[PDB]
Design a protein around this ligand. Sequence first.
Ligand code: K9M
Ligand code: GDP
Ligand code: MG
Length: 168
Amino acid sequence: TEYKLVVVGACGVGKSALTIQLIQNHFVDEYDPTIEDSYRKQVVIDGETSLLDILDTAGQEEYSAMRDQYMRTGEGFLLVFAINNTKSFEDIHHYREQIKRVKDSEDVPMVLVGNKSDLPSRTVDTKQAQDLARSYGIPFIETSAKTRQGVDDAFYTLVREIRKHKEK
Ligand SMILES: *CCC(=O)N1CCN(c2ncnc3c2CCN(c2cccc4ccccc24)C3)CC1
Ligand SMILES: Nc1nc2c(ncn2[C@@H]2O[C@H](COP(=O)(O)OP(=O)(O)O)[C@@H](O)[C@H]2O)c(=O)[nH]1
Ligand SMILES: [Mg+2]
């Protein structure tokens, strides 16, 4: 079984750091913000062997037909914000609308991810994030790519959302 996961969110939120923690169990201080790529990882989730194909989105904000085509192949999306960046939380609505646009569905597996949970400099309340995820009908997972808190949970939870969708 294979799962096409897409990691979206504003520059600097930790998309690349989360991806490399999942794949390689290492925290990257610097990952070129211009590198958009997909990584495959074989994992066992609830006793099911699966291949996770994880697209780490990057580069420039642009909307070619081709870009839509890449993004539309995603079966589930991590909507990543950073808890120290109010703007990245405000941008979650944009990512949610672009997913709704390219998938032509209100029923798309997503997980809201609050990254950089290790930082003291919080500007986005857990309450707000939980309220937003409740309004969207999706899980919320707090993560730190730095300490690896919540990383397996964020990705495995998205897989479980895809399975629940495939049952419908
Ligand atoms: C700092 C560099 C970086 O990580 N990025 C992330 C992606 N960027 C971005 N900013 C705003 N909106 C979008 C993007 C990436 C492309 N996005 C996009 C385009 C077409 C279709 C879809 C579908 C679902 C989600 C996103 C989509 C919009 C800035 C650079
Ligand atoms: N403290 C802390 N720093 C992080 C975390 N995740 C990413 N970073 C750092 O934040 C910066 C941006 O991370 P990156 O993964 O490139 O974000 P992207 O632009 O969304 O791919 C990098 O210097 C990372 O090391 C985190 O959970 N905690
Ligand atoms: Mg990146």
